[PDB]
Symmetry: C2
Subunit: 129 residues, 2 copies
């Protein structure tokens, strides 16, 4: 369930797992259903904070992503230790009303005390149902 | 299966389901794990709105509940029509850092355009792990 994502920092993200998706094949996101993911990254800094920013665009238009807790330290053992690897598991609820699209770009950026912790761009999600 | 809840509105909620939980038996919420829930209710009003408020109390102290999308219309087809029954499914991510407790009270109120859509109090959840 390892999926291909584009790193946009310095390869801190080691592996992104989405059950039911793989590699660079179209990863189908079904409206109204849970979407599970798991990510393993290495901390590039000692940091008390880990804050998530998500940007999604559907056919080139930016859309709000509801239901995300911005504080990643709620789901991990902060503070983070430089050189250690952390695992985060999260289930996102796909809105029943999300616009269908075959051209989806998701950018997630994680900020710590001393700058970006992790950055990934995912281009293979498709929203259907 | 079906779990037991106290209604605090006018019996609009028909059934609450949590997998692995039964009636009034201790329903165990695990730290750092997904908590799945399903509910069917009957709309008592025509409404384009349906906004959720949660309050949680742990051993008699209120604690903030993160990771909740207050717009319930994201997970249903609003507007709602009076007299129709709706089903909502939602997976909540239990914070890794949630205080452990055997005395947990959860109160969920749903508010529509012209008044309370639904209200339930749940007293059998325990936070462990």
């Amino acid at each position: 369930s390892e999926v291909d994502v584009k790193d946009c920092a310095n390869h801190e993200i080691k592996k992104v797992l989405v059950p039911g998706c793989h590699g660079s094949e179209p990863c189908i996101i079904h409206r109204g259903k849970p979407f599970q993911l798991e990510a393993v990254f290495e901390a590039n800094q000692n940091t008390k904070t880990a804050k998530i920013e998500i940007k999604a665009s559907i056919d080139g238009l930016e859309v709000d992503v509801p239901g995300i807790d911005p504080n990643a330290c709620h789901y991990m053992k902060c503070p983070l230790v430089k050189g250690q690897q952390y695992d985060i598991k999260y289930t996102w609820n796909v809105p029943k009303i999300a616009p269908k699209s075959e051209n989806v770009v998701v950018t997630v950026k994680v900020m710590g005390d001393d700058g970006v912790l992790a950055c990934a761009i995912a281009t293979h999600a498709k929203i259907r149902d």
